[PDB]
Amino acid sequence: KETAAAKFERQHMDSSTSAASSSNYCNQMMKSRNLTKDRCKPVNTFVHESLADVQAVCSQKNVACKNGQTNCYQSYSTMSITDCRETGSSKYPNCAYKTTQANKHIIVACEGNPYVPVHFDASV
Ligand SMILES: [Ru+3]
C-alpha cells in the first residue's frame, strides 16, 4: 500500500527538473503521476528541490494550515516549483493544464514518525 509520505512524493516531488521544463510539462506530469486517473485534478504543485530539502521543511517555520490544523510548515528559503492549473477547455480524460514555473516558499503539512510531508498546502 502507498503510504501518505509516498503519495506526497508521487503527487508533489520532481527533483529531476530544475524548473518547469516545457509548456507541456504539466500535461505530461499530471498524467504520469496518475493525477488524471479518475478525473482532472484541478490544481497541483511540483517541487524541484531534493527530497531531503523538502523533508527538512517539517522542522522549519510552523504556520497554520489552510484547514485550521497546526501541522503546517513554511520553507525558510524559496524553492523552485511548478504550478499546474487545469485550463477551461480541459475535458476529462484529456486533462489540459497551464504550466507555470516560480520560486516561492512552500507550505506543507507534516505527520508521523518520521515526521514527513504528507500534503502540499500552499506556496507564498
Ligand atoms: Ru520570501
Side-chain angles (χ1 to χ4, degrees), residues 41-89:
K41 185 174 181 180
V43 302
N44 185 261
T45 299
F46 289 102
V47 181
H48 313 297
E49 295 299 338
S50 69
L51 178 59
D53 280 359
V54 176
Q55 286 173 155
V57 178
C58 292
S59 297
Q60 289 175 30
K61 185 179 178 177
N62 192 204
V63 298
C65 296
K66 282 179 176 178
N67 64 14
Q69 288 304 90
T70 63
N71 63 312
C72 279
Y73 304 80
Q74 181 173 305
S75 60
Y76 288 123
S77 300
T78 63
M79 297 186 160
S80 178
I81 68 177
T82 296
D83 288 304
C84 296
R85 181 178 184 177
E86 191 182 13
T87 62
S89 301

Side-chain angles (χ1 to χ4, degrees), residues 87-99:
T87 62
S89 301
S90 175
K91 294 297 180 180
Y92 181 74
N94 295 163
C95 306
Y97 298 81
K98 171 172 57 63
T99 295

